[PDB]
Amino acid sequence: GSSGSSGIVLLRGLECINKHYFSLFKSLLARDLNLERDNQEQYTTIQIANMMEEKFPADSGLGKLIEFCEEVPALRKRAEILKKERSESGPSSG
């Protein structure tokens, strides 16, 4: 077995998934980000990324996305992988 492949980024959380699933993410945020009604496809992980950066400076979308993956069984495997990166000094356990 080879090693490496440690090039993950809090932003890659989007590029990771296939455009297919991505479309859904934009829909769930359409309300928050206030995306278009029929022009949600013309957008790109980029334009959407920056939007989240300012909007949700907490995770910059990382979080909002992680969830979108949890709901899906084919993304749940990644959701857990993303979270690990999200947290830094442990969450706020209360």
UniProtKB/Swiss-Prot annotation:
Induction comment: By lipopolysaccharides (LPS).
Cellular localization per UniProt: Nucleus
Tissue-specific expression: Mononuclear phagocytes.
Residue ranges constituting the Pyrin domain according to the UniProt record: 8-88
Top-rank lineage group of the source organism: Eukaryota
Protein family per UniProt: Belongs to the HIN-200 family.
Function: Inhibits cell growth via p53/TP53 and RB1-dependent and independent pathways. May work in synergy with TP53 to promote the transcription of CDKN1A/P21.
Subunit structure of this chain's protein: Interacts with HOXB2.
Name under which the protein is recorded: Interferon-activable protein 211
Organism: Mus musculus (Mouse)
